[PDB]
Symmetry: C3
Subunit: 107 residues, 3 copies
């Protein structure tokens, strides 16, 4: 250890490590590949890839493909998503038939 400690010779900023530190299990500081998984889950499970969310891409590859993120189950979506609302709630449209909208109803 003394020989390799003298080998680096660049002890100026206190510690001045040279290694990569591949022995860790779990700590609030240095983290293994698990930190990468934690970031992806936050951005996929609840951040971006929300359940029933609509994703548009120019590549004909599913989200589970090796080229794509390769996480979660990807399903094709048909039609557009519109927020629930009642047509002519304020009687703003003159001479228009009152439209009825059913929640969770597709027609």
């Amino acid at each position: 250890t003394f020989k390799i400690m003298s080998e680096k010779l660049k002890f100026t900023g206190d510690a001045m490590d040279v290694g990569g530190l591949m022995i860790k299990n779990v700590t609030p500081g240095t983290g293994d590949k698990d930190v990468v998984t934690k970031g992806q889950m936050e951005a996929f499970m609840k951040n971006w890839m929300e359940n029933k969310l609509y994703r548009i891409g120019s590549y004909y590859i599913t989200e589970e493909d090796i080229n794509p993120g390769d996480s979660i189950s990807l399903g094709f979506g048909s039609w557009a998503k519109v927020t629930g609302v009642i047509m002519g709630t304020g009687v703003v449209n003159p001479d228009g038939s009152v439209p009825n909208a059913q929640r969770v109803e597709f027609q």
Copy 2:
């Protein structure tokens, strides 16, 4: 090296250095400023905001 650590005298939880350890070479362990660059590549180029997004 020996003299400086003597004034520390408090290194009980291993290193516990007062600096920020502003040097490292490689590995997914200790993180340099490249982690932010690595994050945006993963988020934009291949995971979240892919091509044609």
Copy 3:
């Protein structure tokens, strides 16, 4: 505009926990056209601006 099927606020712990979350009505239309114009394609006068109620 953000679209999601989860009934969780954007500032909630379960959501991303950042920014203010507001309800959005209708679908977002790209700025340039507004839809119905002319039976045979001639084009009507579209609307623009953000937040503007017209």
